[PDB]
Design a protein around this ligand. Structure first.
Ligand SMILES: CCCCCCCCCCCCCCCCCC(=O)OC[C@H](COP(=O)([O-])OCC(O)COP(=O)([O-])OC[C@@H](COC(=O)CCCCCCCCCCCCCCCCC)OC(=O)CCCCCCCCCCCCCCCCC)OC(=O)CCCCCCCCCCCCCCCCC
Ligand SMILES: CCCCCCCCCCCCCCCCCC(=O)OC[C@H](COP(=O)([O-])OCC(O)COP(=O)([O-])OC[C@@H](COC(=O)CCCCCCCCCCCCCCCCC)OC(=O)CCCCCCCCCCCCCCCCC)OC(=O)CCCCCCCCCCCCCCCCC
Ligand SMILES: CC(C)=CCC/C(C)=C/CC/C(C)=C\CC/C(C)=C/CC/C(C)=C/CC/C(C)=C/CC/C(C)=C/CC/C(C)=C/CC/C(C)=C/CC1=C(C)C(=O)c2ccccc2C1=O
Ligand SMILES: CC(C)=CCC/C(C)=C/CC/C(C)=C\CC/C(C)=C/CC/C(C)=C/CC/C(C)=C/CC/C(C)=C/CC/C(C)=C/CC/C(C)=C/CC1=C(C)C(=O)c2ccccc2C1=O
Ligand code: HEM
Ligand code: HEM
Ligand code: HEM
Ligand code: HEM
Ligand SMILES: CCCCCCCCCCCCCCCC(=O)OC[C@H](C)OC(=O)CCCCCCCC[C@@H](C)CCCCCCCC
Ligand SMILES: CCCCCCCCCCCCCC(=O)O[C@H](COC(=O)CCCCCCCCCCC)COP(=O)(O)O
Ligand SMILES: CCCCCCCCCCCCCC(=O)O[C@H](COC(=O)CCCCCCCCCCC)COP(=O)(O)O
Lengths: 533, 533
């Protein structure tokens, strides 16, 4: 029996560790099923894939700056002087079976990690999920985003190719040395001297494979533990209160959904690693300070910083025989941005005065000022990101490069103001669209002509009606309102069968009746539970 | 101020995370205070010091096998060809302020880590702490010891000096390639080809700073969590049962003792790091296959394996045009040893038939067969360890090297048998020594001549006496028995004061009376708890 072996192992485990009650508490934990609550899972799974592929990569990578002569299989670089880091990155992609695939899956997983962190942050901010008791966990997430940005930056610097080395010389070396008083000291502590030196790539490698990922893993553990023991927020809806969680238990539904989502995310990243080239370093050549190429963009999650460098004017100060160069603005700006991101929940509770416990989320339309502010911030982020690509955009879309930088310069002031105003009005406009349905019911789209010639649209009330037949106006409850009759079931269902052949009508009748009975029973269950609380 | 701040922060934490009950459960957890229960945390603290100093070391180490010419300050190696790994190990010890100290603290901490694991294992085995419900946690510890051995080996292989490279060529390369059918394939998977190659040191570096220490950290977490939630064993004693834990709560006594022990272990390892040279690699030179030195010992925790290689005879087989060389025996032997170590609790429950829950420890004298077996195993371990140093012993202690080989060969069979017999008889002899005190009381050492000329020693009974005055024989309770009258308080106390000047007599009287009252109250509390249960 497999049942007998399961019972025997269960009894052995329970007699040795008595975990029954704690395990059962974990099995009975309820998670809300909203689609947007799966956004953090994407970041977690990307991080796991990054760990697996990165461990595979460390078995082959030599991060040395020692200069060598290539002598590998890639003929266009035979005899070319390069570092050991560049040569072993080439050896991974040409001399190890599956190395190019693993490398591309790694770097795509890094892109998906950063992108899903950004999207998940947008959900947290716009729904108000950062509010108490949960602002520490917003802070932890903010730190996670900064660490992911710098981890990804250090990662693609490791191969010591021309493009990434150009990025290192300008950002890591150029901005650092420009910091007032202690800029050159920080530069010579980090590089061991002047750029490029001989220690940089081994040090970045140590930061990238162990130190930063260890901090990230610890912070992700704290983050998930806080979510787990603070009990995920939920949207307003039928039966949902400030004191309960509506959804599904872990066992089995949420566990199955999480595992299947992990498998599908892995599949997407594997398809991208196979089917799309990313960072083909053999085309770039080894890093040489005398060479450069057009189009020196960083990975996208760094582009905004680069975009800021491109847009800020050549404003410098020369006090008492010293120099404060342009880059000092960018560094300061970066700090300001990060400081505003970490501090946002406390800023908002100071401004709004709202310091209440919150477990029910806000729909973004219902908090028009915060939605406008977040839209303004996303507009600025997109403008800086595209300013970083201004040279590519100039080449491909026939815009003067000088024009692109002036468009970015005026835009970083003008576009966020326009976006703020539009987003504010749009949010209030959605509120009014909800009020219309609450007052009049759902517009069905059916127009009829009355005998005297009036044209009226048929409405479907969402609640009770009066003697005249008009609906009683309903109160907004923070939850979405239906606006299409088909979304209320008006379309029915086609005959059941395969796509090409119907099955017997008795089967169709039984199945349809069972489906309607089940739907009614679930609605009644939520309604009665709502009624008694 | 400082109290209102603590209350405010406590309320802020409790309103957001409601941790009061779980935290209080952690504060009230009771740990037994036995000195030998501190052996595991020496290993934990050594591991923590290893992590800190190792992170410091990765900021400077380049693990490349790329050959360069030494350009540093150490004049006796100027112009000498070496790997980048040997280069940067020299740069750490001469060109980074504090680098030699950090490196020596790292290596001493590794030695203390291995030695602590060994001594703690000896406690676990001899006291029976591995018995159910704790078999798994013995297995986890066994894996931890194997991983620590190989982690330390890889760590001292990283600098690529002559001594450690000689160790790599013989053990990692020679034994591996000797393996039947799959030997040479394993060698070429590990080295990327023939020894030495170009990938070995970067790969070992990746294993050493991230992969193996990550597995060790996960296993240590599981280990400590199992101890924490399975509730540490204890020795038999007054008030101790199979169902309770006697000792001190975490807050504050156990926390203070743990922190102070951590500080003292750190102090010892810091004194060793800057008072005793360990591994001065500049004296050894870079690794070259044409060179070797007398005295090729590994670190001590590997010596037994090396000792086995030295002692096993040149027995080889040559079946059908193939070769099974001598080293295969050693490989098999190692596996056997590890398999016997991991499997011991299940072996002993199969042999003894004892499958009961156990929370009370056994005194090693009371389990004479297991004590004899463990003594036999320690004798074999010491013989193999000293066989590894047989050449040093031959030079320093004037023994023929051939004679040391044969002493190790014969002693490998004879010494464990002698040690088993002696340890068995010695354990039973201690049992009889306990029985003597149980029937007759404590020999006080005072001899008295009776009027008719008899000589009698005065005894101190440990329980009630007869009308004749002889003690009633007491029953052994698995706990130690006093054997010195001074350990029962017969010596009194000197007299209160500084070392040179007495305190006022009234102070001395009050202090002595309070001390006696407190001791009596403590004894009475334990006694009445024992009487109740
Ligand atoms: C949020 C986190 C993101 C999640 C990812 C969304 C993917 C798709 C989601 C989906 O299909 O689900 C439908 C889902 C409905 O499902 P549901 O479960 O019923 O929703 C639960 C709630 O009840 C739904 O509550 P709700 O309906 O109140 O909330 C929806 C919506 C409500 O919208 C509002 O409150 C009004 C805000 C309008 C912003 C417009 C500003 C820009 C105008 C441009 C013109 C200026 C020139 O809220 C938002 O969209 C807030 C985010 C605003 C970001 C816009 C930034 C614009 C910058 C571009 C400048 C260039 O609706 C959404 O969530 C819509 C999301 C809108 C996506 C906007 C993102 C754009 C960012 C990049 C654009 C630039 C490209 C160039
Ligand atoms: C165990 C882990 C060790 C912890 C570290 C030891 C620090 C000492 C602390 C101490 O003295 O505290 C007092 C402490 C007892 O105080 P307690 O807190 O009241 O203990 C609570 C229990 O009631 C005490 O229970 P108990 O008194 O029944 O247990 C003490 C003792 C009772 O002993 C027995 O049960 C029988 C005696 C076995 C002796 C083995 C024969 C040795 C071969 C003779 C040479 C022939 C040639 O048990 C053992 O010693 C078991 C370990 C046996 C290992 C010996 C291996 C010998 C191989 C060398 C061959 C060369 O005494 C011990 O624990 C004695 C430690 C014995 C020394 C370890 C063996 C040394 C191995 C290296 C030898 C180097 C050779 C060169
Ligand atoms: C080299 C080369 C070719 C590739 C490199 C390797 C690489 C990049 C990745 C491979 C490793 C990897 C990411 C494997 C994914 C395996 C997965 C996710 C399989 C799931 C399949 C599946 C849904 C089967 C049924 C079991 C079910 C229903 C779920 C169980 C389940 C699973 C499977 C979870 O992963 C999970 C994660 C977090 C919380 C809970 C769960 C959970 O309960
Ligand atoms: C470079 C260079 C010079 C050196 C390299 C750095 C290196 C190798 C190590 C330095 C870092 C290190 C190991 C520091 C040790 C600091 C310690 C252990 C201080 C304790 C001092 C102390 C006992 C003060 C009073 C506080 C008390 C009573 C204890 C609090 C306490 C402490 C301090 C714990 O460590 C602890 C650990 C595990 C569980 C609980 C506790 C705990 O409650
Ligand atoms: C490595 C990056 C991150 C990972 C892997 C991650 C992962 C997750 C996951 C899985 C959840 C729970 C499921 C969900 O709501 O989506 C979650 C919740 C949360 N995350 Fe993140 N997160 C990251 C970064 C961030 C960031 C950038 C923020 C915001 C600054 C943030 C704030 C939160 C908050 C407040 C919650 C709880 C929300 C709630 O209950 O509804 N996290 N995170
Ligand atoms: C936050 C998680 C991580 C991110 C975002 C990340 C990102 C990156 C990026 C962008 C690169 C350059 C990729 C290129 O080849 O095209 C890279 C390279 C590399 N990463 Fe990671 N990485 C992460 C974690 C890890 C981890 C944990 C390891 C771990 C052991 C690792 C090992 C490597 C190695 C060896 C390389 C160099 C190999 C090569 O470039 O191809 N990475 N990483
Ligand atoms: C990295 C190596 C190890 C570390 C850091 C470690 C640490 C510790 C610590 C702190 C304890 C609790 C305190 C104590 O009794 O000393 C403990 C308990 C334990 N260890 Fe270890 N240990 C290691 C290896 C081992 C080994 C090699 C074994 C045996 C094969 C083992 C088996 C146990 C068992 C059975 C306990 C619980 C004993 C009891 O309750 O009395 N551990 N370990
Ligand atoms: C179980 C833990 C560890 C043990 C037993 C151990 C052991 C050793 C030993 C014996 C050495 C040779 C030291 C010497 O130069 O004389 C070494 C080198 C080294 N270890 Fe560790 N180690 C451990 C953990 C770590 C960790 C976690 C790191 C990384 C953070 C690390 C980083 C290094 C580095 C970079 C070297 C080479 C530099 C050098 O030799 O000086 N170690 N290790
Ligand atoms: C770090 C910035 C810390 C400030 C360094 C001290 C300023 C160095 C000025 C000395 C110099 O270089 O040449 C002097 C030049 C002949 O006269 C002028 O300055 C023309 C006036 C235009 C400058 C307006 C300054 C506004 C700056 C602030 C708005 C920035 C705050 C952030
Ligand atoms: C994880 C390794 C082993 C997994 C098997 C354990 C789960 C099945 C055992 C119990 C279910 C069947 C009924 C039964 O045997 O009842 C009992 C066994 O279960 C228990 O009482 C304790 C189980 C708790 C351990 C579970 C921890 C983690 C398991 C989750 C794995 C997904 C025995 O039935 P009986 O005594 O005959 O009435
Ligand atoms: C760890 C950061 C902050 C540490 C401060 C928290 C501990 C002190 C607060 C409570 C003790 C004093 C009495 C008091 O204020 O009573 C109350 C505060 O304590 C609580 O009720 C909750 C405390 C639980 C949090 C502790 C978790 C970790 C702390 C351990 C740190 C070693 C407030 O008293 P009151 O409401 O005025 O009756």
């Amino acid at each position: 029996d497999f049942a007998k072996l399961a019972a025997a192992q269960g009894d052995a485990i329970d007699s040795r560790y008595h975990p029954s009650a704690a395990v059962r508490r974990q099995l009975n934990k309820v998670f809300p099923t909203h689609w947007s609550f799966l956004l953090g899972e994407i970041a977690l799974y990307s991080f796991i894939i990054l760990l697996l592929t990165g461990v595979w990569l460390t078995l082959f990578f030599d991060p040395s700056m020692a200069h060598v002569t290539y002598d590998g299989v890639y003929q266009p670089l035979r005899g070319v002087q390069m570092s050991r880091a560049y040569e072993t990155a080439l050896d991974i992609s040409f001399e190890v079976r599956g190395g190019l695939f693993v490398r591309q899956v790694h770097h795509w997983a890094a892109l998906m990690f950063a992108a899903s962190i950004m999207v998940h942050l947008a959900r947290i901010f716009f729904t108000g999920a950062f509010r108490r008791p949960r602002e520490a966990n917003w802070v932890i997430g903010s730190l996670l985003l900064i660490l992911a940005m710098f981890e990804g930056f250090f990662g693609y610097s490791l191969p010591d190719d021309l493009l990434s080395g150009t990025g290192i010389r300008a950002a890591l070396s150029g901005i650092t040395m420009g910091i007032p008083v202690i800029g050159t000291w920080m530069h010579w502590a980090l590089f061991g001297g002047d750029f490029p030196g001989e220690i940089l790539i081994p040090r970045l490698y140590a930061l990238h494979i162990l130190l930063i990922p260890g901090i990230i893993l610890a912070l992700i553990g704290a983050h998930l533990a806080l979510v787990w023991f603070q009990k995920h927020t939920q949207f307003p809806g039928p039966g949902r209160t400030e004191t309960n969680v509506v959804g599904v238990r872990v066992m089995p539904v949420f566990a199955v959904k999480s595992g299947a989502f992990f498998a599908m995310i892995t599949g997407v990243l594997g398809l991208m690693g196979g089917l799309l080239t990313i960072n083909p370093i053999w085309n770039l050549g080894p890093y040489k300070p005398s060479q450069v190429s057009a189009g020196s963009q960083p990975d996208f999650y760094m582009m905004w910083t680069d975009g800021l460098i491109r847009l800020w004017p050549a404003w410098e100060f020369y006090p008492f025989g010293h120099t404060i160069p342009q880059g000092v603005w960018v560094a300061v700006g970066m700090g300001l941005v990060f400081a505003l991101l970490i501090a946002y929940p406390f800023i908002e509770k100071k401004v709004t005065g709202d310091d209440a416990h919150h477990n029910l989320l806000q729909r973004p339309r219902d908090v028009p000022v915060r939605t406008a502010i977040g839209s303004m911030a996303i507009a600025l982020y997109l403008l800086l990101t595209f300013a970083c690509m201004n040279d590519i955009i100039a080449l491909k879309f026939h815009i003067s490069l000088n024009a692109t930088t002036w468009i970015g310069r005026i835009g970083m002031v003008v576009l966020p103001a326009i976006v703020y105003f539009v987003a504010y009005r749009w949010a209030i406009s959605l509120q009014r669209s909800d009020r219309e349905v609450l007052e009049h019911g759902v517009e069905t789209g059916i127009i009829k002509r009355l005998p005297h010639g009036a044209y009226v649209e048929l409405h479907q009330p969402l609640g009770p009606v009066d003697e005249h037949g008009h609906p009683i106006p309903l109160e907004y409850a923070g939850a979405p309102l239906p606006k299409r009759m088909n979304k209320l079931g008006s379309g029915g269902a086609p005959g059941t069968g395969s796509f090409l052949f119907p099955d017997p009508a008795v089967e169709h009748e039984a199945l349809t009746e069972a489906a309607h009975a089940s739907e009614h029973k679930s609605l009644t269950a939520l309604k009665e539970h709502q009624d008694r609380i």
